[PDB]
Amino acid sequence: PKTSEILDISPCSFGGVSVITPGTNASSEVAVLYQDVNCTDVSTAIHADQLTPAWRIYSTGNNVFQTQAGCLIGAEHVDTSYECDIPIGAGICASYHTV
Amino acid sequence: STDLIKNQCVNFNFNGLTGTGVLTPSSKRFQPFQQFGRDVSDFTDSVRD
Amino acid sequence: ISQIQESLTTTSTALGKLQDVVNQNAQALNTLVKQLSSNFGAISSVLNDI
Amino acid sequence: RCTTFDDVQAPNYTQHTSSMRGVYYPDEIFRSDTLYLTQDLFLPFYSNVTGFHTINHTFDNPVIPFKDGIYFAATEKSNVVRGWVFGSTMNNKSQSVIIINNSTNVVIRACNFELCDNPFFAVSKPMGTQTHTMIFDNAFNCTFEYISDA
Amino acid sequence: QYGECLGLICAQKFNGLTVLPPLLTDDMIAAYTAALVSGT
Amino acid sequence: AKTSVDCNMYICGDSTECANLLLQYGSFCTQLNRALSGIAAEQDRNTREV
Numbered sequence: 001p002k003t004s005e006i007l008d009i010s011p012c013s014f015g016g017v018s019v020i021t022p023g024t025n026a027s028s029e030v031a032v033l034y035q036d037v038n039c040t041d042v043s044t045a046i047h048a049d050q051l052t053p054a055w056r057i058y059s060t061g062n063n064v065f066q067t068q069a070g071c072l073i074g075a076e077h078v079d080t081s082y083e084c085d086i087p088i089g090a091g092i093c094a095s096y097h098t099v
Numbered sequence: 100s101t102d103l104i105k106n107q108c109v110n111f112n113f114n115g116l117t118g119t120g121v122l123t124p125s126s127k128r129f130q131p132f133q134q135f136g137r138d139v140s141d142f143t144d145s146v147r148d
Numbered sequence: 149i150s151q152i153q154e155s156l157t158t159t160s161t162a163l164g165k166l167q168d169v170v171n172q173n174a175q176a177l178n179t180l181v182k183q184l185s186s187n188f189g190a191i192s193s194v195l196n197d198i
Numbered sequence: 199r200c201t202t203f204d205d206v207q208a209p210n211y212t213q214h215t216s217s218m219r220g221v222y223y224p225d226e227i228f229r230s231d232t233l234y235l236t237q238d239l240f241l242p243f244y245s246n247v248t249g250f251h252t253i254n255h256t257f258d259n260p261v262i263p264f265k266d267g268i269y270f271a272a273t274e275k276s277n278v279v280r281g282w283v284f285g286s287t288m289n290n291k292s293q294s295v296i297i298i299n300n301s302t303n304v305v306i307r308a309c310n311f312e313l314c315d316n317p318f319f320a321v322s323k324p325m326g327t328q329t330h331t332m333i334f335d336n337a338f339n340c341t342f343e344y345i346s347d348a
Numbered sequence: 349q350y351g352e353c354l355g356l357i358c359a360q361k362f363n364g365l366t367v368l369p370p371l372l373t374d375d376m377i378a379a380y381t382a383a384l385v386s387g388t
Numbered sequence: 389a390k391t392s393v394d395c396n397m398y399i400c401g402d403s404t405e406c407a408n409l410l411l412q413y414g415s416f417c418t419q420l421n422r423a424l425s426g427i428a429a430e431q432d433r434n435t436r437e438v
């Protein structure tokens with residue numbers, strides 16, 4: 001109204017979250033997949049507690065990786081190929097393995 | 100009040116709770132601050148006389 | 149026949165199909181039971197209470 | 199007349215992990231051999247806690263905010279802590295309550311108290327006997343009182 | 349119409365509908381088919 | 389197609405007042421998501437089988 005600019009509207013980011021784990025007996029490690037989002041928005045919303053759900057304790061370490069289905073937090077990328085244990089999407093595969 | 104009528108299909112009104120059933124003795128062990136027990140689906144399962 | 153017997157003695161995953169059948173049926177019944185506790189906007193979930 | 203302990207040190211608040219403590223029975227109804235999922239006020243696991251300590255000259259009696267609910271735990275060798283006091287203004291302006299493990303009888307009251315700045319119980323070393331209870335100068339508009347059994 | 353990103357600019361529309369991608373990408377499928385024709 | 393749906397944006401969207409009403413129906417759309425995710429996994433299995 002004030003300047004007769006034309007402005008678009010679009011929604012704030014949303015999606016599903018799902019948890020990747022090896023067996024509980026083997027270890028308590030987890031990796032989190034945020035589906036169909038660019039990591040810049042979720043990292044800039046984890047910091048300063050803008051995301052929800054809000055864990056009491058967690059951290060995004062240096063391990064952040066981008067995939068077509070979304071981006072994984074807490075998983076380390078590797079430049080080698082193996083047979084799939086847990087399929088993620090778009091060709092990205094996961095497993096629990098030695099460093 | 101009335102006496103109890105165990106092992107027969109009867110109407111029962113123990114304490115504001117109503118239904119029909121077969122009363123039998125039990126081996127529950129209530130704490131002194133618990134008067135009722137419940138199963139899943141919120142059905143009453145046992146009562147303290 | 150010996151090697152197949154040892155495999156069956158130690159494996160757990162080989163029968164996942166039959167296990168999935170059992171789990172599917174049990175989960176379905178569990179859900180149908182749990183629905184009784186819902187309220188559907190009634191003043192209470194307990195029929196005899198009302 | 200209130201007695202003020204001079205030369206008392208300021209406290210050194212200390213941090214500890216509470217670990218998993220603080221779970222309590224959510225409801226009276228009996229249940230067995232089942233997993234139950236419920237929402238209520240609870241103490242979250244591995245939350246930090248503010249430790250306090252009375253040793254030698256040190257004596258800490260600091261007003262602590264309530265935040266609509268507190269956990270509490272004490273480690274005592276010979277009944278050092280006798281109870282608590284709950285109030286909002288504690289200056290002749292708001293109802294206050296006292297809970298104390300008096301040796302003769304437990305006493306709970308909810309009346310205007312005007313509690314002494316440094317309330318305490320007086321004891322003698324060789325006799326092991328209590329001599330004074332300097333908790334409150336007076337009490338007016340008293341509307342509640344309770345006494346436990348002897 | 350629905351939210352999707354092909355490339356990766358990801359956009360999302362108020363209706364909340366979404367389309368997930370396939371696991372096997374088209375060049376991996378074409379490598380299976382060329383392996384079959386080659387071996388046969 | 390292997391499509392997916394989000395329950396709260398479609399039925400209730402931005403508002404919170406409507407979500408406090410949808411709460412009275414319980415688990416229903418969550419088993420819905422469970423179903424539609426099973427269909428999604430099945431499509432991948434079909435292609436890997438062929």
Ligand SMILES: *[C@@H]1O[C@H](CO[C@@H]2O[C@@H](C)[C@@H](O)[C@@H](O)[C@@H]2O)[C@@H](O[C@@H]2O[C@H](CO)[C@@H](O)[C@H](O)[C@H]2NC(C)=O)[C@H](O)[C@H]1NC(C)=O
Nearest residue numbers: 300301302303304305328329330331343344345346347348
């Ligand atoms: C501990 O308290 C008891 C009882 O509480 C007293 O009575 C309450 C109504 C209130 O006025 C408290 O402040 C009081 O202390 C005390 O024992 C009482 O002593 C009086 C005589 O002083 C006697 O008339 C009461 O019957 C007693 N009450 C009993 C026996 O239950 C006691 O002195 C307090 N202190 C100690 C160290 O025990």
Ligand SMILES: *[C@@H]1O[C@H](CO)[C@@H](O[C@@H]2O[C@H](CO)[C@@H](O)[C@H](O)[C@H]2NC(C)=O)[C@H](O)[C@H]1NC(C)=O
Nearest residue numbers: 264265266285286287288289290291292293294
């Ligand atoms: C009951 O609680 C209310 C709110 O928790 C108290 O009101 C506060 O009083 C202080 C006194 O200085 C004000 O600074 C605050 O702004 C008030 N509101 C809040 C939210 O803190 C009230 O004092 C309590 N009752 C009594 C008798 O003290």
Ligand SMILES: *[C@@H]1O[C@H](CO)[C@@H](O[C@@H]2O[C@H](CO)[C@@H](O)[C@H](O)[C@H]2NC(C)=O)[C@H](O)[C@H]1NC(C)=O
Nearest residue numbers: 287288289290291310311312313314315335336
């Ligand atoms: C609670 O109220 C009493 C009485 O109103 C206060 O006692 C007064 O104290 C002042 C100075 O301390 C004296 O000048 C007055 O003469 C006292 N009043 C009476 C009637 O003797 C008492 O101080 C109040 N509590 C606090 C903590 O201030």
Ligand SMILES: *[C@@H]1O[C@H](CO)[C@@H](O)[C@H](O)[C@H]1NC(C)=O
Nearest residue numbers: 212213214245246247248249
């Ligand atoms: C726990 O430490 C945090 C800082 O990490 C602080 O904000 C909080 O007040 C502490 N909890 C206490 C003192 O109970």
Ligand SMILES: *[C@@H]1O[C@H](CO)[C@@H](O)[C@H](O)[C@H]1NC(C)=O
Nearest residue numbers: 290310336337338339340341
């Ligand atoms: C008790 O309270 C009344 C009003 O509630 C007040 O008039 C009276 O002065 C109080 N009693 C005292 C101060 O002793």
